[PDB]
């Protein structure tokens with residue numbers, strides 16, 4: 001029993017982290033096979049960051065200007081290219097610790113583990129979600145850029161995020177491993193405001209199911225609702241609209257608990273309208289939205 | 305910026321997890337040098353668990369009855385001994401992936417990462433604290449026993465916990481790596497009630513400092529207090545008494561923020577007396593007590 005905000009074991013990703021230095025800028029790279037992936041802004045002076053022309057800046061850079069260090073051993077760079085907002089550094093050595101891997105672009109509401117690194121060295125692991133405004137609420141200091149987000153399916157690491165930016169509001173923006181930003185963000189030190197950070201309704205419902213499974217039941221009520229009625233309430237509380245796709249996705253948790261999804265919706269509706277009245281659910285005084293239905297099933301069944 | 309509930313990178317501990325089977329009971333072991341550590345209740349049938357006599361049960365067990373599997377390779381057991389509530393299985397092979405390590409017995413209020421495992425395979429990592437009643441609030445299913453808690457100091461893993469028990473209230477009890485239970489708990493399926501789960505005051509203050517550092521300031525007030533006055537309020541709210549040792553420990557966060565510890569105490573006092581009024585601090589509607597002052601400094605400075 002018990003339900004925790006749980007990250008994937010990070011070992012497979014620890015074995016992929018290196019230090020990239022270009023001039024006086026040091027950040028993290030991901031070493032997979034004979035390619036090191038890092039944020040293209042490694043080539044910038046923080047002056048350049050005001051209005052960088054990355055193609056123009058890159059002309060002035062050679063393979064030997066990219067200093068790649070894996071533990072305390074230097075890798076030889078034999079090639080470099082820009083793909084969107086990431087650099088691919090070709091090195092003469094395949095990472096011997098390359099796990100089975102994919103690059104996936106996740107949807108908003110999807111959760112992932114971050115291995116926070118400084119100078120290519122892991123400092124910690126935590127669980128995130130891609131917010132509906134395509135930000136993440138991370139823990140990232142200067143030097144953390146090139147830290148990656150990932151899911152694991154048994155032996156296969158799916159990389160979904162690389163850290164690039166802190167917005168003025170202290171939320172985070174980054175790319176998939178093809179260098180494409182999540183959301184409308186750009187690797188430029190300019191005015192970038194996030195949109196509405198709405199609550200991930202399907203994740204809140206998943207976590208309400210996790211609470212019932214784990215003995216926290218006080219919030220279960222005698223009511224049901226409809227998707228349309230529930231959605232009026234969600235709109236009013238800046239919750240994401242619930243679709244039949246979400247209802248289908250919660251089917252297994254529905255089955256296990258014998259609580260109809262629309263009944264749990266009616267419970268969530270009362271919690272939005274009445275608040276928690278100083279009570280908690282799985283040790284939280286607010287409705288947690290950074291567990292997917294998949295996360296809840298994984299943790300409640302004990303997948304390795 | 306940003307502040308997350310952050311676990312140590314788990315790679316060094318992933319490399320230590322094995323499967324121990326005795327008869328029809330499978331749980332996890334920790335392989336360090338040529339010793340595998342696991343919960344002694346591995347030798348029990350769940351019938352035995354009602355009133356086990358472990359010395360008597362152990363007589364009926366030989367080295368060859370302990371099946372130790374590291375990935376998909378069996379280790380040869382050449383010796384076994386009971387130390388308190390753990391078994392030490394001597395194997396003929398040193399774990400090639402043994403990190404630098406210590407066994408430490410932590411104090412209540414101290415935080416640690418748990419690598420949850422099933423059949424010797426890591427499933428997830430999360431951050432815990434030793435509660436003042438010597439329980440932890442974990443995420444542990446059947447098969448998770450022998451999962452370990454740890455801190456890392458650069459290269460040295462300090463093992464502080466091994467998972468043994470779920471209490472009827474769904475909180476967790478376990479041992480240090482010398483097999484001594486935290487608290488008054490015993491590896492017996494009997495009536496064991498936890499004492500008062502008080503709030504770790506010094507940890508709440510550390511997290512209030514982390515909030516100020518990270519731009520969450522609304523709760524800072526114009527008041528100060530004394531240790532004696534603050535402690536009257538703490539007593540009333542089942543918060544741990546604050547000592548001068550705690551004040552000294554918060555000194556660095558005091559210095560960095562320019563907020564006197566006793567001023568931050570007065571802020572905490574108002575939050576206890578007035579509540580959050582529907583506001584949040586670092587994304588939480590309750591006062592977080594599972595970050596130590598050391599954790600806050602580590603995360604806010606970016607130690608690897």
Ligand SMILES: *CC(=O)N1CCN(S(=O)(=O)c2cccs2)CC1
Nearest residue numbers: 025026027046142143144145164
């Ligand atoms: C994003 C990241 O981790 N970076 C880019 C900025 N540099 S830096 O310019 O060297 C700075 C260091 C402290 C303040 S800016 C660090 C790596």
Ligand SMILES: *CC(=O)N1CCN(S(=O)(=O)c2cccs2)CC1
Nearest residue numbers: 329330331350446447448449468
């Ligand atoms: C604590 C732990 O992880 N254990 C001990 C109990 N066994 S068991 O008896 O095989 C059970 C499996 C499911 C219910 S009890 C599993 C390992």
